[PDB]
């Protein structure tokens, strides 16, 4: 399987990858909102 | 008299009750082999609980 | 007459009886509910003289 | 496939057993009284349809 | 049954009375495919009821037609 | 009444007296389909019942 | 070890990994019903259902077909594994259940279920050898043995069929 | 008279009687409100026209 | 959870694409690479069906109707609200059904089984592909596919039948129906024989292969044998779907008149013209 | 928080997550492309004052 | 009369009773809901004299 | 299975639950009756 | 099966329960008749 | 009363109950959402006297 | 309350919970998106005074 | 179940509660009669 | 399976959770009735 | 299965996860209510 | 970041990726090809001001 | 599987492959934009 | 369950809490009567 150390190492990549993806999506929504707001 | 209720609707819900009763019966029969299940948390029966293992007697030639 | 329970297992007969009565009761209720005279959910508050009656002979 | 066995005396203890499984006769294709009458009645039905 | 015939799966009565590996593989294929399985006996009950219910439900549909409902649409 | 009022100065549609930014359209479900209410409504759109047979 | 397999890892749905030789241990597609009754299958009249054909002179080859007895058996690695000595027949539904092969190397006779064998042209012509696609000629030496050589138990039927069933996955495994 | 209670569980007795009294009291009030015109006269006294 | 004999069989191997990467279980279900693609196509296709219901007139289960495009769009992808959504769902369905057959092949390989089940299921996929791909392509518009709706597809079947005035006269349809009806009889017969030897009347020994062979021979006048009845059932059930695929693909691409007047060739055989 | 990766195999949580996001992204794009206001392939060049807005029928 | 719980397994009978009551109550509610007089979700706030009644004999 | 001692204990609860259920149902019927009589 | 002694005991309940059911059905018919006679 | 949990495994009962309540809640909400009076997504902002009422007796 | 995680394996409950919430969220969004009042992709820029309302009682 | 001495003790409270209940109900009826007599 | 001690412990949780759920449902019905009465 | 220590450790994350999710949902509902109230 | 190839055997990921991109590219092209604005096989020679717009 | 050293070697080509693909697509989009803008 | 010792303590608090409840309710009704009398 994996150790806590390997789990903790993977978790760091997973958390940062998730937040990075959410940042890119946040900018995409900013662009979409500027083009054609939905509210 | 009853407008929305009619005999074809009555008959159909009678069939549905029979049919779900039959599916339950068949799933009990499906569990006479291989059950109870093994699991990490212990034995499991699912649902419905299976019918028991069945013993067969063979024609005596003695 | 009690000897008939040697002839038939009462654990079988009790289930068969209850099933027979439950079906028969539902059949009679729904037959009446489908009639005009006895459609009691819609017309149950009508008095007996107000209740429907099926057509009589015209004596032709 | 293509290594068929062929059994000269009767299987069921190509060919077929003449014998009994208790009340049941083995050998001929079973009719009994109900089967014979069924074929007679059914034949007349088929004949009436075809002749019409 | 043809997929396990190499292992004697077509001898279904033996597989019902004395479960072989052919029965076990038959059960596991369907369990692994769709999440539930029958047994070598009870698959014949599923078969029996599906055939029988074809003509039984059909007959009720005919008896209702023109007696209870005159226009099904 | 099939369209909302239009402000003649801006050309904007007015909904409940207040302007909408955009070109307004009336929403409808796929191809304008509408659920059939009941048998009586379906029969109200048909021809009358056929006359009795000539026997 | 007495355990035939261990989990690949600690997660719930993980596969098992065999410890020893899986064809011999009976793991994966090489496994058999280990609880199966160790007695012969019987006919309606109570005789043994599957028997070598010499034990019942009622049975013969259909006169158009080749008798396979004497022919060489060719294993998956294209070696000769042996020759067919005898046929075993099902007396309830008359057919050949097993060929019996005397091994070419060594001395033992082993059973070989039909349906693992095939003819070079599926019977159509040239019926001079038998093909066993599933196992190599060395693996023929370990085919499970019946405790008598005129009779086979339901457990022995399962073990033998399971050995050839495992071959497609394991015959060339390291 | 107390011999009637022998073999019973007292909590079963109090559950049975407790159920019955709640049921009877509710039925009696639902009935009484229809007959006595109360609280309908109360509501009419404080209603806004 | 596992059957009491199951754990022994859960080995690696027999996959087609993914190697060991997806070679695992999730509850009872085997996954594998085509498990992953199955769930992808199943989820996408189902959510687009729910979207088609949402933009349609009602949520009533029976009345939901995702229709194909108008014939004017030919073999193009129409606007999504105009029937392009039906076209996306159709691609998802093909992906799901194909993935399901390949996943079954991995399961059969892992168990040392023959490939009979994947190939039998291929008969159903063939019939679906004929209805939504091959026949629409031969007619030149995807709009010839059937709508996705529990009763609205029965309206399609009705109207396609009457496009040929009297579809009962379709000769391939007559064969396909005969296979379906013969299959159902054969299933009742085989199911009854196995059950009646394994469940004899109370106080009677368990029956034998010989008894079902005797009785079956009284029923049909020949003995089919244990493997033969399963070959027959597979032949009848799959042959029904194959003749179904034929009967619909000849209607329109190859024959365009009423089906009754197809029989004119039989009336004009020269022995009796 | 990282002990979640002791409960579940990261190699197949990550497959399930990537698959989920792929389905969700495609669903949202097809939903928007089905709409009138966000049919961007046909009407993406319209300015926001020209973009469609759906309303109910006037209740006259 | 308690010997019914020896005659039958109470675990099984009690599930059968729960299933029977479940189905029976749902049948009666849906029959009433699709009547005219007792379609309480649409018309429950009508007074007893305002509620629909079936037609009398002519 | 059950002993006959358990069977009598069980029957006491089964009767008391049956009575409670009949009480609730009869209140429900009299509420329904007062709102919209069916006879 | 069961003994003739058990059969007599069961029969006594079964007859009494049957007659009880018929008595309750008699009252239901009395009430139905006085509501809306069918002859 | 607690001896009911000797007759039935509480782990099984809670799954059965949670499944029952989920289905029952969804059924009741969909029934109401299908009605005229309680189509609350379309009409929830109407006052109680403005909300639909089914037809009376004539 | 952590007692509950001895009766049920966390790994199974979290799978159940994720599945239930994913489906429930998708149900509610599609139901709203199918309505007139909350079809926000077409009409989300309307003000609350401009949004559709279902028909009242006459 | 409950023994004779338990039953004897239980009965004393049971009668007392019943009489207390009937006393309260009697006062309620006297008040009701003085407010809106029903015969 | 459970000891009767375990069963009695679970019963306490089970009854409390049931009545807690019924209480929350009571407040939901109070709010629903105050918004749009069904009788 | 778990140790009871691991049950405690897991439960704390579960409470915070449930709470944080309910908070996000509560803000989401109040945004929706402010834009287009449903009662 | 390279360790993703220890989790996922790259020889397989390339084949899945290529497959996914191939299908995605085809779907996008067919969506465009049968739109009004981008049916370039029929109207590709129109200038940007002559190209259709899906005004309601 | 491969070693971490092989993974670092393979990952280098995978970046340049991806970058080259993104570059070609970026040119393809700007050509398409120049011909017929979508916003 | 409770011992007779626990029951004797519990009863005293239950009786006291009930009396506090009834007293506070009595004040509530006296105020309500003085505000809007209902007979
Ligand atoms: C129930 C009380 C009321 C009764 C009255 C009304 C209903 C009457 C029918 C009752 C049938 C039993 C229901 C049940 O609880 O089953 C549990 C069992 C699971 O296997 P098990 O052996 O019993 O248990 C093992 C398991 O507990 C422990 O192992 P593990 O932990 O590894 O298992 C994971 C679990 C998780 O459990 C679940 O997820 C249960 C899911 C139940 C889904 C039912 C959906 C029904 C509505 C669909 C609406 C549609 C949604 C799209 O187990 C699983 O992974 C689940 C494996 C089964 C997968 C079933 C796939 C779909 C089956 C067909 C659906 C119907 C198609 C028409 O699952 C099954 O056996 C389901 C399939 C059996 C029925 C197939 C019937 C097909 C009839 C087709 C003809 C229709 C003609 C009109
Ligand atoms: C273990 C305790 C016993 C029991 C012992 C008592 C005692 C002692 C008293 C009552 C009282 C009552 N009980 Mg109780 N009761 C039991 C079970 C029930 C059940 C049931 C669903 O099983 C019901 C419907 C009832 C119903 C009733 C009412 C008729 C009445 C007061 C209202 C009420 O219900 O409050 C409670 C609501 C519930 C849902 C029941 C829960 C249990 C509560 C704690 C019982 C009330 C105790 C009460 C506050 C004590 C006050 C003492 C004063 C000296 C009067 N009981 C259980 C089995 N019940 C009182 C009475 O007779 O008034 C006429 C009373 O003095
Ligand atoms: C335009 C035509 C109508 C239509 C009209 C009907 C009618 C009318 C009927 C059916 C019936 C059936 N239809 Mg339909 N059907 C249509 C469209 C379809 C479609 C489709 C894809 O569109 C399908 C798959 C079906 C399928 C079916 C079956 C499910 C069902 C027959 C079951 C069965 O086994 O019968 C075959 C089995 C039998 C007939 C039993 C025979 C048993 C006896 C004992 C055999 C005796 C043999 C005898 C001894 C041999 C000698 C005889 C002499 C030579 C004379 N219908 C459309 C909508 N369909 C039947 C049904 O049940 O309806 C509810 C029915 O009556
Ligand atoms: C016209 C009617 C009169 C009036 C007449 C009377 C009379 C007469 C009496 C009372 C009594 C009470 N009144 Mg009053 N009362 C009025 C107006 C009010 C108002 C107000 C307007 O804000 C309030 C807060 C109260 C409050 C109260 C209580 C202090 C008391 C009952 C206590 C009890 O046990 O409650 C128990 C109930 C609760 C705790 C439920 C509260 C529910 C809350 C609002 C919502 C919770 C939601 C949440 C999600 C639930 C989670 C559950 C957990 C997760 C498990 N009244 C008006 C002016 N009231 C009685 C009293 O004094 O008793 C001692 C009494 O006799
Ligand atoms: C579960 C539903 C399905 C079903 C089941 C089913 N059918 C069955 C059975 C079962 C389980 C039987 O056991 C029974 C049977 O025998 O099967 C072989 C049968 C059967 N299903 C039949 C047909 C049939 N089943 C159909 C359908 C179905 N069967 C459903 C799909 C259909 C359709 C689709 O239309 C048909 C046509 C028969 C083959 C058979 C019943 C045979 C029967 O009743 O025969 C009666 C007799 C005659 C017709 C007369 C024959 C006359 C001879 C040809 C004359 C020759 C001369 C004669 C010798 C003269 C007399 C001299 C005397 C001295 C002898
Ligand atoms: C029509 O409108 C409708 C649709 C109806 C409206 C409704 C919509 C709804 C309901 C939407 C819901 C959305 C949702 C809900 O949660 C959405 C949730 C989304 C989430 C959580 C996204 C998460 C993304 C995470 C990513 C991308 C992670 C990437 C990680 C990377 C790259 C690192 C990998 C690891 C490495 C490299 C380390 C190896 C080293 C190792 C091993 C070592 O060193 O050992
Ligand atoms: C057409 O008509 C239509 C429209 C359909 C209308 C008609 C509808 C109808 C007929 C409806 C009928 C409804 C009905 C009928 O009875 C409804 C019955 C409902 C019921 C019974 C609900 C019960 C809920 C109980 C709950 C929620 C319990 C929760 C328990 C909790 C939280 C604690 C769990 C344990 C813990 C935490 C720790 C344990 C300890 C351990 C492990 C330890 O210590 O080890
Ligand atoms: C209708 O409109 C709708 C469709 C609805 C709108 C929505 C659309 C949506 C949602 C789109 C989503 C797009 C998307 C999302 O992720 C798209 C993601 C795209 C991606 C990631 C593309 C990546 C491409 C990478 C390539 C090509 C790499 C090539 C590598 C090469 C050539 C080198 C190989 C290695 C070598 C040679 C070395 C061997 C050495 C070895 C072995 C050694 O040395 O050992
Ligand atoms: C409008 O129309 C219709 C509706 C029809 C009109 C009609 C309505 C009707 C009929 C109403 C009837 C109402 C009614 C009838 O009875 C109402 C009955 C009300 C009652 C009884 C209320 C009782 C309240 C009791 C309380 C608050 C007690 C609290 C006690 C506490 C806090 C202490 C707990 C214990 C401790 C601390 C000891 C631990 C020691 C231990 C463990 C140890 O020592 O070991
Ligand atoms: C692949 C992950 C997603 C990258 C997406 C690109 C945008 C986001 C910025 C990435 C910047 C670097 O991001 C950071 O990388 C380091 C390693 O370099 C990760 O570090 C991780 O692994 C290292 C060892 O390799 C551990 O000691 C550490 O505990 C663990 O968190 C961090 O968890 C991540 O936050
Ligand atoms: C709605 C209520 C009013 C109408 C319905 C009345 C229903 C019938 C109630 C009958 C109750 C008493 O019924 C009577 O019970 C006793 C035991 O108590 C039964 O007696 C039973 O056990 C005794 C020994 O214990 C045997 O000797 C006897 O043969 C056996 O039947 C009687 O056979 C039955 O007649
Ligand atoms: C779609 C909307 C979803 C909204 C969900 C909102 C969930 C909000 C967080 C609560 C749930 C997760 O649980 C929360 O995880 C974070 C992750 O940083 C933990 O955060 C903290 O603890 C962990 C573990 O020691 C540290 O590694 C971390 O650096 C520290 O910030 C919190 O202690 C925990 O309470």
């Amino acid at each position: 399987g994996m150790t806590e150390e390997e789990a903790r190492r993977f978790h760091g990549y997973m958390v940062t990858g998730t937040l990075g993806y959410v940042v890119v999506a946040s900018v995409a929504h900013f662009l979409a909102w500027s083009w054609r707001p939905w509210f | 008299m009853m407008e929305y209720i009619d005999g074809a609707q009555i008959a159909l819900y009678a069939f549905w009750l029979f049919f779900f009763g039959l599916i339950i019966y068949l799933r009990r029969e499906d569990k006479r082999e291989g059950y109870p299940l093994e699991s990490p948390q212990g034995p499991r029966d699912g649902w419905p609980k299976g019918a028991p293992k069945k013993t067969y007697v063979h024609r005596d030639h003695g | 007459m009690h000897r008939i329970w040697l002839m038939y297992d009462p654990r079988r007969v009790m289930v068969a009886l209850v099933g027979f009565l439950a079906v028969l009761a539902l059949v009679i209720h729904f037959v009446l509910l489908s009639s005009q005279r006895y459609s009691w959910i819609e017309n149950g508050t009508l008095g007996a003289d107000q209740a429907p009656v099926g057509a009589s002979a015209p004596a032709a | 496939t293509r290594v068929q066995v062929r059994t000269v005396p009767e299987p069921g203890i190509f060919s077929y057993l003449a014998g009994k499984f208790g009340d049941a006769q083995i050998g001929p294709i079973y009719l009994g009284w109900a089967g014979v009458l069924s074929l007679i009645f059914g034949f007349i039905a088929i004949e009436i349809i075809g002749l019409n | 049954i043809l997929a396990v015939a190499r292992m004697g799966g077509e001898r279904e009565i033996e597989q019902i009375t004395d479960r072989g590996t052919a029965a076990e593989r038959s059960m596991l294929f369907w369990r692994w495919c769709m999440g539930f399985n029958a047994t070598m006996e009870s698959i014949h009950r599923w078969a029996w009821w599906f055939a029988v219910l074809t003509t039984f439900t059909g007959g009720i549909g005919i008896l209702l037609t023109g007696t209870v409902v005159d226009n099904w649409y | 009444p099939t369209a909302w009022p239009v402000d003649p100065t801006t050309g904007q549609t007015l909904i409940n007296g207040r302007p909408v930014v955009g070109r307004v359209f009336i929403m409808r479900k796929t191809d304008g389909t509408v659920k059939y209410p009941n048998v009586a409504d379906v029969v109200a759109h048909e021809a009358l019942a056929p006359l009795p047979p000539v026997v | 070890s007495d355990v035939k397999f261990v989990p690949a890892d600690n997660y719930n749905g993980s596969p098992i990994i065999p410890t020893g030789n899986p064809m011999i241990d009976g793991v994966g597609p090489a496994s058999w019903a280990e609880d199966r009754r160790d007695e012969p299958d019987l006919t309606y009249h109570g005789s043994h259902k599957i028997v070598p054909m010499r034990l019942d002179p009622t049975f013969s080859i259909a006169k158009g077909d080749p008798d396979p007895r004497g022919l060489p058996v060719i294993a998956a690695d294209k070696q000769v594994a042996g020759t067919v000595v005898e046929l075993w027949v099902n007396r309830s539904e008359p057919q050949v259940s097993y060929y019996e092969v005397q091994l070419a190397s060594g001395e033992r006779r082993v059973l070989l279920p039909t349906g693992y064998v095939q003819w070079p042209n599926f019977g159509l012509w040239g019926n001079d050898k038998l093909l066993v696609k599933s196992i190599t000629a060395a693996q023929f030496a370990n085919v499970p043995a019946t405790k008598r050589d005129d009779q086979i138990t339901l457990l022995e039927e399962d073990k033998i069929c399971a050995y050839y069933a495992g071959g497609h996955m394991y015959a060339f495994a390291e | 008279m107390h011999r009637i209670w022998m073999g019973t569980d007292p909590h079963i007795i109090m559950s049975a009687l407790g159920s019955f009294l709640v049921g009877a009291v509710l039925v009696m009030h639902i009935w009484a409100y229809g007959q006595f015109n109360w609280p309908a006269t109360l509501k009419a006294k404080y209603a806004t026209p | 959870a596992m059957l009491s004999f199951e754990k022994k069989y859960r080995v690696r191997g027999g996959t087609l694409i993914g190697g060991d990467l997806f070679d695992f279980w999730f509850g009872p279900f085997y996954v594998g690479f085509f498990g992953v693609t199955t769930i992808f196509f199943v989820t996408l296709g189902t959510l687009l069906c729910v979207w088609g219901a949402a933009m349609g007139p009602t949520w009533n289960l029976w009345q939901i109707n995702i229709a194909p495009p108008d014939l004017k769009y030919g073999l193009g992808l129409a606007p999504l609200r105009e029937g392009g959504l039906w076209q996306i769902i159709t691609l998802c369905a093909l992906g799901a059904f194909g993935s399901w057959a390949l996943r079954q092949a991995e399961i059969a390989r892992k168990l040392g089984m023959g490939m009979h089940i994947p190939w039998a299921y291929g008969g159903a996929i063939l019939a679906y592909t004929t209805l939504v791909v091959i026949r629409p392509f031969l007619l030149g518009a995807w709009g010839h596919g059937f709508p996705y709706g529990i009763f609205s597809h029965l309206d399609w079947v009705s109207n396609v039948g009457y496009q040929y005035l009297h579809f009962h006269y379709n000769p391939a349809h007559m064969i396909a129906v005969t296979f379906f009806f013969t299959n159902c009889l054969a299933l009742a017969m085989h199911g009854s024989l196995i059950l009646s030897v394994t469940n004899p009347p109370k106080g009677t020994p368990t029956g034998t292969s010989e008894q079902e062979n005797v009785f079956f021979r009284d029923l049909l006048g020949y003995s089919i044998g244990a493997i033969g009845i399963h070959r027959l059932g597979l032949f009848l059930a799959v042959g029904a779907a194959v003749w179904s695929a034929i009967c619909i693909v000849i209607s329109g691409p190859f024959w365009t008149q009423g089906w009754p007047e197809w029989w004119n060739w039989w009336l004009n055989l020269p022995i009796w013209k």
Side-chain angles (χ1 to χ4, degrees), chain D residues 1-8 14, chain G residues 53 58-69 87 89 94-96:
Chain D
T1 65
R2 311 305 172 190
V3 188
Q4 302 153 98
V5 295
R6 164 262 191 168
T7 59
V8 182
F14 191 47
Chain G
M53 193 166 75
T58 309
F59 289 75
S60 62
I61 313 304
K63 192 163 285 188
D65 289 1
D67 186 340
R69 292 174 288 184
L87 311 184
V89 294
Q95 72 200 278
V96 188

Side-chain angles (χ1 to χ4, degrees), chain G residues 20-105:
Chain G
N21 179 308
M23 293 184 70
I24 296 174
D25 295 342
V27 180
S31 60
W32 63 89
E34 287 145 327
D35 51 348
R36 204 177 200 202
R37 188 165 55 91
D38 192 30
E39 300 185 323
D41 196 9
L42 305 184
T43 64
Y44 177 85
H45 288 89
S47 66
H48 298 159
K49 189 184 295 172
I50 294 154
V51 296
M53 193 166 75
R54 68 188 169 70
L55 207 79
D56 200 328
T58 309
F59 289 75
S60 62
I61 313 304
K63 192 163 285 188
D65 289 1
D67 186 340
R69 292 174 288 184
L71 295 189
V73 177
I74 306 307
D77 61 339
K78 316 300 184 181
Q79 315 307 298
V80 176
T83 58
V84 182
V85 163
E86 177 57 321
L87 311 184
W88 292 51
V89 294
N90 182 321
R91 299 199 286 186
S92 295
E93 181 177 325
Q95 72 200 278
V96 188
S97 299
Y98 303 88
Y99 300 158
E100 182 168 6
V101 173
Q102 167 58 242
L103 296 182
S105 301

Side-chain angles (χ1 to χ4, degrees), chain B residues 2 8-9 12-13 16 19 23 27 29 39 43 53 59:
Chain B
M2 295 299 270
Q9 182 188 31
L12 182 62
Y13 285 106
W16 290 134
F19 182 65
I23 301 304
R27 292 301 300 148
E29 293 302 319
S39 208
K53 270 281 292 196
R59 189 177 293 265

Side-chain angles (χ1 to χ4, degrees), chain D residues 17-28 30, chain G residues 44, chain I residues 211 214-215 218:
Chain D
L17 172 65
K20 283 177 178 275
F21 291 0
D23 196 34
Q25 183 63 47
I26 315 297
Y30 170 78
Chain G
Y44 177 85
Chain I
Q211 281 156 282
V214 168
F215 197 10
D218 293 318

Side-chain angles (χ1 to χ4, degrees), chain I residues 17-19 21 33 76-78 88:
Chain I
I17 288 191
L21 173 59
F33 174 73
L77 177 52
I88 304 303

Side-chain angles (χ1 to χ4, degrees), chain I residues 36-102:
Chain I
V36 171
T37 62
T38 294
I39 301 305
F40 180 87
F41 288 123
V42 168
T43 308
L44 181 63
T46 306
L47 294 176
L48 294 175
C49 288
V50 175
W51 171 233
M55 70 185 184
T58 183
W59 285 109
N60 180 307
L61 175 62
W62 317 122
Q63 296 185 51
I64 289 159
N65 178 37
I66 300 98
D70 282 328
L71 303 193
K72 73 179 185 176
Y73 290 104
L75 300 176
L77 177 52
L80 295 186
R81 71 187 94 88
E82 292 197 40
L85 184 70
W86 179 94
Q87 297 177 269
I88 304 303
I89 291 158
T90 301
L91 298 173
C92 300
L94 292 166
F97 302 162
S99 301
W100 194 266
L102 292 170

Side-chain angles (χ1 to χ4, degrees), chain B residues 11-58:
Chain B
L12 182 62
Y13 285 106
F15 182 78
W16 290 134
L17 296 177
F18 171 79
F19 182 65
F20 298 138
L22 180 69
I23 301 304
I24 290 161
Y25 165 78
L26 292 172
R27 292 301 300 148
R28 281 175 47 84
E29 293 302 319
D30 290 348
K31 294 182 176 191
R32 295 190 188 266
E33 291 289 344
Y35 282 70
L37 305 179
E38 298 183 328
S39 208
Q41 310 102 29
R44 292 297 178 262
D45 303 81
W47 190 90
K49 286 196 175 197
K53 270 281 292 196
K54 185 170 166 185
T55 50
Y56 297 92
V57 295
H58 306 103

